[PDB]
Amino acid sequence: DVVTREYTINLHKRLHGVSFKKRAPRAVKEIKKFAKLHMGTDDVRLAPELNQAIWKRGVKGVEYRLRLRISRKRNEEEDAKNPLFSYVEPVLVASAKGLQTVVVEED
Amino acid sequence: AKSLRASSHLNAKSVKRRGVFQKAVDAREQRISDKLKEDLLKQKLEDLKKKE
Amino acid sequence: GHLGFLPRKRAASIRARVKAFPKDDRSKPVALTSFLGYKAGMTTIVRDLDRPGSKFHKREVVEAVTVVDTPPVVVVGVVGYVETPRGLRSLTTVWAEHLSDEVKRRFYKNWYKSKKKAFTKYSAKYAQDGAGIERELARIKKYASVVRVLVHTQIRKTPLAQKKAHLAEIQLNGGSISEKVDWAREHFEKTVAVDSVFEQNEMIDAIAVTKGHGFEGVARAGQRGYHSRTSINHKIYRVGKGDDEANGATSFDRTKKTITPMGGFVHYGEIKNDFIMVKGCIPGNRKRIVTLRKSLYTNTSRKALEEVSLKWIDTASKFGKGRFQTPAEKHAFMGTLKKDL
RNA sequence: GUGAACAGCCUCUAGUUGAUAGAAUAAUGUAGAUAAGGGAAGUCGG
RNA sequence: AGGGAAUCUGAACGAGAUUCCCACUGUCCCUAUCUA
RNA sequence: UUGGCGGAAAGGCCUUGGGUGCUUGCUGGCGAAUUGCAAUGUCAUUUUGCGUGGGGAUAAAUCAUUUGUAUACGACUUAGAUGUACAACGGGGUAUUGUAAGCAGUAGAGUAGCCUUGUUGUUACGAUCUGCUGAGAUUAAGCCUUUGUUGUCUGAUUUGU
């Protein structure tokens, strides 16, 4: 089932007690793990714009709550994770603090 | 100082334990067992709530 | 260190079992000898001290007490033990025919995968005029020098996210073994309250598995913590009630409040049921199951005979710093706020 | 370029991202901090 | 626009040495916690 | 087959009877040999497996994920096949810091600037003070609570008296 939702992820919670040199790469791994939790598929692909969003404040200053657009799709022929992939994009907001997980209407 | 296992202190404490010192515990026990007997009747009323 | 507390190793389980019991008098009424709950909490009390001979006679003393949460223990069985030249030997246990979801959970390590087929043939074994159950109860009453009660805790009424209750064994110090096994017969599927075991001004010995600190480095390196410790002579200051509001109310304070602090205890919930407020500090941490036995012997000094006149219960915020007893006193002192109006 | 300054801190031109990785994060060890009250009582010897 | 005062040594000295007076500190009483 | 008894390892002891073979209590009649002059001459009792012909009974554990009362790793405590279930968010509390961003003002040193040469005259610049503002931010990661919204519920192995 190809379904797209949006999610606020508490990166203050997951990156708590993590060394300053390794927050941003872990934040990539935490977003991937979060998307694997919610979509039930292995291949979590990430937007290059989302990568720009994480790594904005260097390595030591990744934000507390980020609002994402995790999207289930269908993966093409010659695939090892058979046969669905998630794709995570950022969405524009002044503050991500205080948003409900909402199903995106596709047109 | 007299030890914890000093014979005379054990005998003086046995002089205590045959007086007030046990009687208060033997009154407290009766009050505890009383409320325990009171705890059967409440639950039996909640048996009769369903039996109604 | 202390060579008695050896080997300094990790315990068999979090629920430490009680090693010894209070003796026995064969003329006393039937009453429980040990109780269990869930230790979680610590708080400050003031009281006027009627301890004559002291430097604080007719003065006021502040002191630290601990709040063990104790939901009403439920009886689900009875054990009979024969006296042997080899110790004791359990010859027959008998159960309650219909047990909770909590205890049938205690019988499995993986609860969700199972067909939940625990006591199906045992309940079908009951399914008649008794006949075999009364046979095993005759077996207990005929022999078996001591009789212990199988109980369990009400885990769901406690804010713990565990769902899985603890089985225990509690002996009876009420004389005539007939009255022991027949008290049990009157108590299958039924529950036992706290204040039917304890009251105020009563010394107890709370046993607990002592707060694990893990690996540590003759004064030797190895394991520190997670040991099963028995601490004796902690005075019960208050027995409480769940339905009764104003548990935090004393003879003096008399404000309608629960002993539960603002935003609850740290790492543990509120209190929604019966509790014991014991003086000093019980071993183990918060969320820890403690088993409270009673004294072993007649332990009367003036530290055991005196009556406690509780003056005030501190219910201020333990999480952070303490400034207000009630939420009502926070917004009474504060005035009115932004999101209020 | 800021700055009184060859102090640093930031960059333009140009050139790199090479050094096994990943998962955990308890004690110990080395190094650096902070600490009630007292202020060398430590130690042969601040 | 860290002090100060004496003395032993080659009146100030010289990161000379010693002693004392004043100040300071986990050196210690007595360790506790955090980071790399 | 009627009970009674036995808890010290009871696991056995007595007893009520009906049937049922046998009895060397006593007396008869058959059969044995050639295993050749001896050769343990195998008749006991365990633990099983394959076959039979009848009864009976309808699992959990581990891995994987989670939990954190546990934790070097093991191990331990938890949680999860339609629920006062769990996960993510979300709200409410409790705490920590100390008045967020933005905007406005008559509060304004000192100045530029129109000349009505000012007795809060004026237009503008204008540290800071003041107000919206105990606000704003953070608040579980090892705090509490959950009538909100959204989703998950099924993968592999191993085990027999």
Side-chain angles (χ1 to χ4, degrees):
Chain A
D1 298 321
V2 163
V3 198
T4 301
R5 290 149 204 101
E6 288 189 354
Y7 301 102
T8 28
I9 179 176
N10 198 6
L11 246 72
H12 187 224
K13 191 157 70 71
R14 281 164 186 84
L15 307 169
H16 189 276
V18 178
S19 296
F20 278 141
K21 284 199 269 283
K22 281 172 186 177
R23 321 160 73 70
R26 195 182 280 266
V28 167
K29 297 182 193 84
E30 290 310 292
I31 285 160
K32 281 193 173 180
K33 203 259 194 178
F34 178 82
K36 201 179 170 285
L37 171 78
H38 278 291
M39 297 290 162
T41 188
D42 314 324
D43 190 13
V44 177
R45 300 191 193 175
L46 283 186
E49 290 181 307
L50 181 131
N51 179 59
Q52 290 193 54
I54 298 159
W55 289 83
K56 205 263 164 71
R57 287 176 175 86
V59 284
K60 308 183 177 184
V62 197
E63 280 199 341
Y64 300 132
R65 274 167 200 86
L66 289 164
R67 176 74 172 178
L68 323 168
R69 186 192 285 172
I70 311 177
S71 320
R72 204 146 87 200
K73 287 168 190 181
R74 285 177 191 186
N75 218 340
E76 296 296 313
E77 201 61 69
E78 294 178 308
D79 184 74
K81 298 302 186 175
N82 311 100
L84 280 85
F85 76 104
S86 296
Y87 193 79
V88 192
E89 294 162 38
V91 291
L92 296 154
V93 73
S95 181
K97 175 78 178 175
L99 299 180
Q100 315 291 300
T101 160
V102 145
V103 187
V104 139
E105 291 168 57
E106 285 187 340
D107 299 314
Chain B
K2 302 275 184 180
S3 71
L4 184 269
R5 294 169 294 113
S7 295
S8 63
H9 273 259
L10 269 65
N11 283 116
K13 282 159 92 170
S14 73
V15 168
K16 290 157 84 172
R17 278 187 197 99
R18 60 175 69 96
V20 184
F21 300 82
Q22 201 184 340
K23 284 172 185 178
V25 190
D26 286 327
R28 179 169 65 196
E29 197 222 339
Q30 289 291 333
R31 294 192 295 271
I32 283 157
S33 184
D34 186 68
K35 207 173 184 180
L36 182 61
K37 285 295 285 289
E38 285 168 357
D39 204 25
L40 281 105
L41 294 162
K42 291 186 285 293
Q43 201 150 23
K44 277 173 86 182
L45 283 162
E46 267 88 54
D47 293 335
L48 290 169
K49 289 278 101 185
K50 295 277 99 185
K51 279 185 180 75
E52 197 186 304
Chain C
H2 194 287
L3 299 170
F5 295 92
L6 262 66
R8 216 152 70 250
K9 73 186 285 298
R10 304 218 290 269
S13 289
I14 279 99
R15 190 192 64 82
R17 80 276 172 277
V18 175
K19 288 209 165 181
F21 277 132
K23 284 182 92 281
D24 201 352
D25 181 75
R26 210 156 275 267
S27 68
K28 284 182 182 182
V30 187
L32 256 68
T33 61
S34 57
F35 197 80
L36 50 67
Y38 292 103
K39 198 266 258 186
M42 194 75 60
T43 177
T44 343
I45 309 304
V46 308
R47 70 179 187 101
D48 57 327
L49 197 75
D50 299 321
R51 193 181 282 157
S54 307
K55 258 185 87 78
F56 312 107
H57 189 61
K58 299 296 182 290
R59 259 65 59 93
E60 296 165 358
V61 64
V62 75
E63 58 199 347
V65 302
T66 167
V67 177
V68 44
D69 193 20
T70 48
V73 147
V74 31
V75 172
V76 289
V78 121
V79 194
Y81 293 95
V82 297
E83 255 182 32
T84 58
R86 289 140 71 84
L88 293 165
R89 176 258 166 108
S90 59
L91 87 161
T92 302
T93 64
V94 68
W95 294 93
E97 184 212 2
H98 293 287
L99 290 87
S100 182
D101 200 71
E102 305 172 352
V103 270
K104 286 170 98 283
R105 186 179 265 135
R106 170 64 55 182
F107 277 83
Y108 314 121
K109 220 154 285 293
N110 293 316
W111 170 245
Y112 85 112
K113 277 178 283 188
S114 61
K115 294 281 186 74
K116 305 172 186 76
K117 200 167 269 191
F119 280 76
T120 52
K121 292 191 205 181
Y122 183 86
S123 300
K125 195 258 293 297
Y126 190 95
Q128 54 179 344
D129 59 336
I133 305 294
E134 206 66 49
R135 179 68 269 163
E136 298 301 313
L137 255 95
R139 176 74 46 79
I140 294 158
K141 201 196 265 79
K142 194 172 176 175
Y143 317 115
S145 65
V146 70
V147 180
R148 299 196 190 174
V149 176
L150 286 163
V151 308
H152 76 92
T153 346
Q154 283 175 8
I155 186 67
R156 53 93 188 180
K157 210 185 262 78
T158 298
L160 282 165
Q162 207 191 342
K163 290 194 184 82
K164 196 177 178 284
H166 304 82
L167 258 311
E169 271 200 19
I170 293 92
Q171 86 160 22
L172 300 155
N173 278 150
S176 69
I177 38 86
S178 176
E179 284 185 305
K180 291 192 208 287
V181 66
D182 294 337
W183 185 94
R185 190 81 278 265
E186 286 176 332
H187 280 82
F188 285 109
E189 303 162 337
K190 314 286 169 182
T191 186
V192 175
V194 187
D195 41 30
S196 66
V197 176
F198 300 137
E199 65 165 59
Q200 284 184 22
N201 303 309
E202 192 189 331
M203 306 293 267
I204 52 92
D205 31 20
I207 75 102
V209 165
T210 195
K211 180 66 165 283
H213 290 95
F215 196 87
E216 207 66 38
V218 288
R220 208 68 180 178
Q223 177 70 44
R224 187 172 72 83
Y226 199 70
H227 316 296
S228 79
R229 295 280 172 271
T230 297
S231 281
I232 65 115
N233 286 347
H234 295 276
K235 180 176 274 310
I236 292 166
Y237 270 23
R238 195 182 283 274
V239 188
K241 287 187 84 69
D243 61 339
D244 188 71
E245 188 66 30
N247 297 313
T250 57
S251 192
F252 299 83
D253 195 75
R254 71 168 75 131
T255 68
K256 276 185 82 72
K257 68 182 194 177
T258 321
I259 48 100
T260 291
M262 303 195 298
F265 304 102
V266 203
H267 300 100
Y268 179 83
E270 295 209 13
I271 307 280
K272 282 188 177 179
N273 36 14
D274 301 311
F275 69 92
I276 316 161
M277 199 178 73
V278 194
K279 106 159 285 282
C281 40
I282 291 165
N285 53 357
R286 73 287 171 282
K287 299 193 287 295
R288 180 82 74 201
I289 170 148
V290 293
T291 315
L292 293 88
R293 189 187 56 199
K294 57 179 272 285
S295 309
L296 291 159
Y297 67 97
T298 312
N299 205 341
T300 321
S301 63
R302 304 271 87 82
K303 300 269 189 177
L305 197 272
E306 64 190 21
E307 53 182 61
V308 294
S309 51
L310 303 169
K311 202 180 282 298
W312 170 65
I313 298 162
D314 175 76
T315 183
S317 184
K318 282 94 176 68
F319 171 68
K321 286 278 166 78
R323 286 193 307 275
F324 311 105
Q325 297 293 294
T326 57
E329 281 305 300
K330 192 183 170 186
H331 76 84
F333 172 84
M334 218 95 171
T336 187
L337 300 158
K338 177 83 177 282
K339 73 268 181 177
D340 297 341
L341 55 104

PDB file of all heavy atoms in Angstrom, chain C residues 232-255:
ATOM      1  N   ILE C 232      16.175  -4.726  59.464  1.00  0.00           N
ATOM      2  CA  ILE C 232      15.202  -4.897  60.552  1.00  0.00           C
ATOM      3  C   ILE C 232      14.932  -3.597  61.319  1.00  0.00           C
ATOM      4  O   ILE C 232      15.761  -2.679  61.297  1.00  0.00           O
ATOM      5  CB  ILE C 232      15.584  -6.070  61.507  1.00  0.00           C
ATOM      6  CG1 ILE C 232      16.884  -5.799  62.273  1.00  0.00           C
ATOM      7  CG2 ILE C 232      15.687  -7.396  60.764  1.00  0.00           C
ATOM      8  CD1 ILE C 232      16.676  -5.673  63.763  1.00  0.00           C
ATOM      9  N   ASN C 233      13.765  -3.533  61.972  1.00  0.00           N
ATOM     10  CA  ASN C 233      13.356  -2.428  62.869  1.00  0.00           C
ATOM     11  C   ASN C 233      13.123  -1.063  62.205  1.00  0.00           C
ATOM     12  O   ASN C 233      13.717  -0.051  62.598  1.00  0.00           O
ATOM     13  CB  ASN C 233      14.317  -2.289  64.063  1.00  0.00           C
ATOM     14  CG  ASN C 233      14.135  -3.378  65.095  1.00  0.00           C
ATOM     15  OD1 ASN C 233      13.152  -4.125  65.076  1.00  0.00           O
ATOM     16  ND2 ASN C 233      15.085  -3.467  66.019  1.00  0.00           N
ATOM     17  N   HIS C 234      12.250  -1.045  61.202  1.00  0.00           N
ATOM     18  CA  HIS C 234      11.778   0.198  60.603  1.00  0.00           C
ATOM     19  C   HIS C 234      10.334   0.406  61.050  1.00  0.00           C
ATOM     20  O   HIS C 234       9.462  -0.410  60.735  1.00  0.00           O
ATOM     21  CB  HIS C 234      11.871   0.137  59.075  1.00  0.00           C
ATOM     22  CG  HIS C 234      13.267   0.027  58.553  1.00  0.00           C
ATOM     23  ND1 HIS C 234      14.084   1.122  58.373  1.00  0.00           N
ATOM     24  CD2 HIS C 234      13.990  -1.049  58.162  1.00  0.00           C
ATOM     25  CE1 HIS C 234      15.253   0.725  57.901  1.00  0.00           C
ATOM     26  NE2 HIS C 234      15.223  -0.589  57.766  1.00  0.00           N
ATOM     27  N   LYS C 235      10.091   1.482  61.799  1.00  0.00           N
ATOM     28  CA  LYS C 235       8.760   1.758  62.346  1.00  0.00           C
ATOM     29  C   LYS C 235       7.780   2.225  61.269  1.00  0.00           C
ATOM     30  O   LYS C 235       8.090   3.129  60.488  1.00  0.00           O
ATOM     31  CB  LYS C 235       8.832   2.775  63.492  1.00  0.00           C
ATOM     32  CG  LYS C 235       7.474   3.098  64.105  1.00  0.00           C
ATOM     33  CD  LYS C 235       7.550   4.037  65.302  1.00  0.00           C
ATOM     34  CE  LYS C 235       7.796   3.294  66.608  1.00  0.00           C
ATOM     35  NZ  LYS C 235       6.870   2.147  66.840  1.00  0.00           N
ATOM     36  N   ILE C 236       6.607   1.589  61.237  1.00  0.00           N
ATOM     37  CA  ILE C 236       5.487   2.031  60.396  1.00  0.00           C
ATOM     38  C   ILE C 236       4.877   3.304  60.989  1.00  0.00           C
ATOM     39  O   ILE C 236       4.425   3.323  62.145  1.00  0.00           O
ATOM     40  CB  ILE C 236       4.416   0.925  60.208  1.00  0.00           C
ATOM     41  CG1 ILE C 236       4.988  -0.223  59.372  1.00  0.00           C
ATOM     42  CG2 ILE C 236       3.149   1.484  59.559  1.00  0.00           C
ATOM     43  CD1 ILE C 236       4.165  -1.490  59.403  1.00  0.00           C
ATOM     44  N   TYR C 237       4.881   4.357  60.180  1.00  0.00           N
ATOM     45  CA  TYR C 237       4.376   5.659  60.582  1.00  0.00           C
ATOM     46  C   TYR C 237       2.916   5.859  60.195  1.00  0.00           C
ATOM     47  O   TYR C 237       2.139   6.409  60.983  1.00  0.00           O
ATOM     48  CB  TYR C 237       5.274   6.762  60.015  1.00  0.00           C
ATOM     49  CG  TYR C 237       6.424   7.156  60.926  1.00  0.00           C
ATOM     50  CD1 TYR C 237       6.910   6.279  61.910  1.00  0.00           C
ATOM     51  CD2 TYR C 237       7.038   8.406  60.796  1.00  0.00           C
ATOM     52  CE1 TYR C 237       7.956   6.646  62.745  1.00  0.00           C
ATOM     53  CE2 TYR C 237       8.094   8.781  61.622  1.00  0.00           C
ATOM     54  CZ  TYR C 237       8.548   7.898  62.594  1.00  0.00           C
ATOM     55  OH  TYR C 237       9.585   8.260  63.419  1.00  0.00           O
ATOM     56  N   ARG C 238       2.549   5.397  58.996  1.00  0.00           N
ATOM     57  CA  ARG C 238       1.167   5.471  58.511  1.00  0.00           C
ATOM     58  C   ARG C 238       0.800   4.328  57.562  1.00  0.00           C
ATOM     59  O   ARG C 238       1.571   3.967  56.667  1.00  0.00           O
ATOM     60  CB  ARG C 238       0.896   6.829  57.841  1.00  0.00           C
ATOM     61  CG  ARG C 238      -0.581   7.145  57.622  1.00  0.00           C
ATOM     62  CD  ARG C 238      -0.797   8.479  56.920  1.00  0.00           C
ATOM     63  NE  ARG C 238      -0.612   9.618  57.822  1.00  0.00           N
ATOM     64  CZ  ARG C 238      -1.554  10.137  58.608  1.00  0.00           C
ATOM     65  NH1 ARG C 238      -2.784   9.635  58.629  1.00  0.00           N
ATOM     66  NH2 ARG C 238      -1.262  11.173  59.385  1.00  0.00           N
ATOM     67  N   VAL C 239      -0.383   3.762  57.787  1.00  0.00           N
ATOM     68  CA  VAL C 239      -1.042   2.887  56.820  1.00  0.00           C
ATOM     69  C   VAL C 239      -2.105   3.744  56.135  1.00  0.00           C
ATOM     70  O   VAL C 239      -2.881   4.435  56.804  1.00  0.00           O
ATOM     71  CB  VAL C 239      -1.686   1.645  57.489  1.00  0.00           C
ATOM     72  CG1 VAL C 239      -2.192   0.659  56.442  1.00  0.00           C
ATOM     73  CG2 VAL C 239      -0.697   0.948  58.414  1.00  0.00           C
ATOM     74  N   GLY C 240      -2.129   3.701  54.804  1.00  0.00           N
ATOM     75  CA  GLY C 240      -3.034   4.538  54.016  1.00  0.00           C
ATOM     76  C   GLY C 240      -4.134   3.820  53.255  1.00  0.00           C
ATOM     77  O   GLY C 240      -4.186   2.587  53.220  1.00  0.00           O
ATOM     78  N   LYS C 241      -5.015   4.617  52.650  1.00  0.00           N
ATOM     79  CA  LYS C 241      -6.159   4.117  51.886  1.00  0.00           C
ATOM     80  C   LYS C 241      -6.309   4.847  50.553  1.00  0.00           C
ATOM     81  O   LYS C 241      -6.123   6.064  50.476  1.00  0.00           O
ATOM     82  CB  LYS C 241      -7.450   4.226  52.706  1.00  0.00           C
ATOM     83  CG  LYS C 241      -7.572   3.212  53.842  1.00  0.00           C
ATOM     84  CD  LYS C 241      -8.942   3.245  54.512  1.00  0.00           C
ATOM     85  CE  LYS C 241      -9.985   2.409  53.773  1.00  0.00           C
ATOM     86  NZ  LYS C 241      -9.727   0.942  53.851  1.00  0.00           N
ATOM     87  N   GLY C 242      -6.655   4.089  49.514  1.00  0.00           N
ATOM     88  CA  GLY C 242      -6.776   4.609  48.149  1.00  0.00           C
ATOM     89  C   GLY C 242      -8.030   5.419  47.890  1.00  0.00           C
ATOM     90  O   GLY C 242      -7.960   6.513  47.320  1.00  0.00           O
ATOM     91  N   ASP C 243      -9.175   4.868  48.302  1.00  0.00           N
ATOM     92  CA  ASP C 243     -10.484   5.530  48.183  1.00  0.00           C
ATOM     93  C   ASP C 243     -10.587   6.796  49.041  1.00  0.00           C
ATOM     94  O   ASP C 243     -11.240   7.770  48.649  1.00  0.00           O
ATOM     95  CB  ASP C 243     -11.628   4.548  48.515  1.00  0.00           C
ATOM     96  CG  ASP C 243     -11.561   3.992  49.947  1.00  0.00           C
ATOM     97  OD1 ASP C 243     -10.481   4.013  50.583  1.00  0.00           O
ATOM     98  OD2 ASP C 243     -12.608   3.519  50.437  1.00  0.00           O
ATOM     99  N   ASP C 244      -9.931   6.764  50.201  1.00  0.00           N
ATOM    100  CA  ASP C 244      -9.893   7.884  51.130  1.00  0.00           C
ATOM    101  C   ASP C 244      -8.971   8.987  50.613  1.00  0.00           C
ATOM    102  O   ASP C 244      -7.755   8.800  50.499  1.00  0.00           O
ATOM    103  CB  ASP C 244      -9.449   7.407  52.522  1.00  0.00           C
ATOM    104  CG  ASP C 244      -9.575   8.488  53.587  1.00  0.00           C
ATOM    105  OD1 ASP C 244     -10.716   8.833  53.963  1.00  0.00           O
ATOM    106  OD2 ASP C 244      -8.528   8.979  54.060  1.00  0.00           O
ATOM    107  N   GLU C 245      -9.576  10.126  50.281  1.00  0.00           N
ATOM    108  CA  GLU C 245      -8.852  11.372  50.036  1.00  0.00           C
ATOM    109  C   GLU C 245      -8.377  11.921  51.391  1.00  0.00           C
ATOM    110  O   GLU C 245      -8.865  11.486  52.443  1.00  0.00           O
ATOM    111  CB  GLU C 245      -9.766  12.368  49.299  1.00  0.00           C
ATOM    112  CG  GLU C 245      -9.121  13.665  48.796  1.00  0.00           C
ATOM    113  CD  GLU C 245      -8.084  13.477  47.694  1.00  0.00           C
ATOM    114  OE1 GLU C 245      -8.194  12.524  46.890  1.00  0.00           O
ATOM    115  OE2 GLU C 245      -7.153  14.310  47.624  1.00  0.00           O
ATOM    116  N   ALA C 246      -7.427  12.860  51.351  1.00  0.00           N
ATOM    117  CA  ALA C 246      -6.788  13.452  52.541  1.00  0.00           C
ATOM    118  C   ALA C 246      -5.947  12.437  53.339  1.00  0.00           C
ATOM    119  O   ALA C 246      -6.028  12.357  54.571  1.00  0.00           O
ATOM    120  CB  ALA C 246      -7.802  14.194  53.421  1.00  0.00           C
ATOM    121  N   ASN C 247      -5.149  11.662  52.604  1.00  0.00           N
ATOM    122  CA  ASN C 247      -4.145  10.765  53.183  1.00  0.00           C
ATOM    123  C   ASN C 247      -2.946  11.571  53.673  1.00  0.00           C
ATOM    124  O   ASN C 247      -2.337  11.234  54.692  1.00  0.00           O
ATOM    125  CB  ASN C 247      -3.688   9.721  52.159  1.00  0.00           C
ATOM    126  CG  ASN C 247      -4.808   8.797  51.717  1.00  0.00           C
ATOM    127  OD1 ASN C 247      -5.564   8.267  52.535  1.00  0.00           O
ATOM    128  ND2 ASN C 247      -4.911   8.588  50.410  1.00  0.00           N
ATOM    129  N   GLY C 248      -2.623  12.633  52.934  1.00  0.00           N
ATOM    130  CA  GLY C 248      -1.582  13.591  53.306  1.00  0.00           C
ATOM    131  C   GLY C 248      -1.970  14.485  54.473  1.00  0.00           C
ATOM    132  O   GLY C 248      -1.117  15.171  55.043  1.00  0.00           O
ATOM    133  N   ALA C 249      -3.258  14.482  54.817  1.00  0.00           N
ATOM    134  CA  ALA C 249      -3.763  15.214  55.971  1.00  0.00           C
ATOM    135  C   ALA C 249      -3.355  14.530  57.266  1.00  0.00           C
ATOM    136  O   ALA C 249      -3.462  13.306  57.404  1.00  0.00           O
ATOM    137  CB  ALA C 249      -5.275  15.359  55.901  1.00  0.00           C
ATOM    138  N   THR C 250      -2.868  15.343  58.195  1.00  0.00           N
ATOM    139  CA  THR C 250      -2.546  14.904  59.547  1.00  0.00           C
ATOM    140  C   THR C 250      -3.602  15.458  60.510  1.00  0.00           C
ATOM    141  O   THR C 250      -4.605  16.042  60.076  1.00  0.00           O
ATOM    142  CB  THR C 250      -1.132  15.368  59.975  1.00  0.00           C
ATOM    143  OG1 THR C 250      -1.043  16.793  59.880  1.00  0.00           O
ATOM    144  CG2 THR C 250      -0.046  14.728  59.110  1.00  0.00           C
ATOM    145  N   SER C 251      -3.378  15.263  61.809  1.00  0.00           N
ATOM    146  CA  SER C 251      -4.192  15.882  62.854  1.00  0.00           C
ATOM    147  C   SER C 251      -4.020  17.403  62.856  1.00  0.00           C
ATOM    148  O   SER C 251      -4.932  18.134  63.245  1.00  0.00           O
ATOM    149  CB  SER C 251      -3.817  15.307  64.221  1.00  0.00           C
ATOM    150  OG  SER C 251      -4.764  15.668  65.209  1.00  0.00           O
ATOM    151  N   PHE C 252      -2.856  17.862  62.396  1.00  0.00           N
ATOM    152  CA  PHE C 252      -2.485  19.276  62.404  1.00  0.00           C
ATOM    153  C   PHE C 252      -2.722  19.961  61.049  1.00  0.00           C
ATOM    154  O   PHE C 252      -3.451  20.950  60.982  1.00  0.00           O
ATOM    155  CB  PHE C 252      -1.028  19.447  62.870  1.00  0.00           C
ATOM    156  CG  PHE C 252      -0.766  18.954  64.274  1.00  0.00           C
ATOM    157  CD1 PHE C 252      -0.517  17.598  64.531  1.00  0.00           C
ATOM    158  CD2 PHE C 252      -0.749  19.848  65.347  1.00  0.00           C
ATOM    159  CE1 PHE C 252      -0.270  17.148  65.824  1.00  0.00           C
ATOM    160  CE2 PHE C 252      -0.502  19.402  66.643  1.00  0.00           C
ATOM    161  CZ  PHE C 252      -0.263  18.050  66.882  1.00  0.00           C
ATOM    162  N   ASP C 253      -2.128  19.426  59.979  1.00  0.00           N
ATOM    163  CA  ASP C 253      -2.220  20.023  58.633  1.00  0.00           C
ATOM    164  C   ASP C 253      -3.657  20.081  58.088  1.00  0.00           C
ATOM    165  O   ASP C 253      -4.107  21.137  57.635  1.00  0.00           O
ATOM    166  CB  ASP C 253      -1.294  19.288  57.653  1.00  0.00           C
ATOM    167  CG  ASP C 253      -1.070  20.059  56.363  1.00  0.00           C
ATOM    168  OD1 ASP C 253      -0.305  21.044  56.378  1.00  0.00           O
ATOM    169  OD2 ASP C 253      -1.648  19.665  55.328  1.00  0.00           O
ATOM    170  N   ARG C 254      -4.351  18.939  58.145  1.00  0.00           N
ATOM    171  CA  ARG C 254      -5.771  18.755  57.745  1.00  0.00           C
ATOM    172  C   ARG C 254      -6.253  19.369  56.403  1.00  0.00           C
ATOM    173  O   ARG C 254      -7.438  19.690  56.239  1.00  0.00           O
ATOM    174  CB  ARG C 254      -6.740  19.048  58.920  1.00  0.00           C
ATOM    175  CG  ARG C 254      -6.893  20.504  59.360  1.00  0.00           C
ATOM    176  CD  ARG C 254      -8.073  20.657  60.308  1.00  0.00           C
ATOM    177  NE  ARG C 254      -7.778  20.150  61.651  1.00  0.00           N
ATOM    178  CZ  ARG C 254      -8.008  20.807  62.788  1.00  0.00           C
ATOM    179  NH1 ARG C 254      -8.570  22.008  62.780  1.00  0.00           N
ATOM    180  NH2 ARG C 254      -7.695  20.245  63.947  1.00  0.00           N
ATOM    181  N   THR C 255      -5.331  19.495  55.446  1.00  0.00           N
ATOM    182  CA  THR C 255      -5.669  19.911  54.079  1.00  0.00           C
ATOM    183  C   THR C 255      -5.892  18.671  53.219  1.00  0.00           C
ATOM    184  O   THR C 255      -5.086  17.735  53.260  1.00  0.00           O
ATOM    185  CB  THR C 255      -4.579  20.804  53.438  1.00  0.00           C
ATOM    186  OG1 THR C 255      -3.389  20.040  53.212  1.00  0.00           O
ATOM    187  CG2 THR C 255      -4.248  21.991  54.327  1.00  0.00           C
TER     188      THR C 255
END
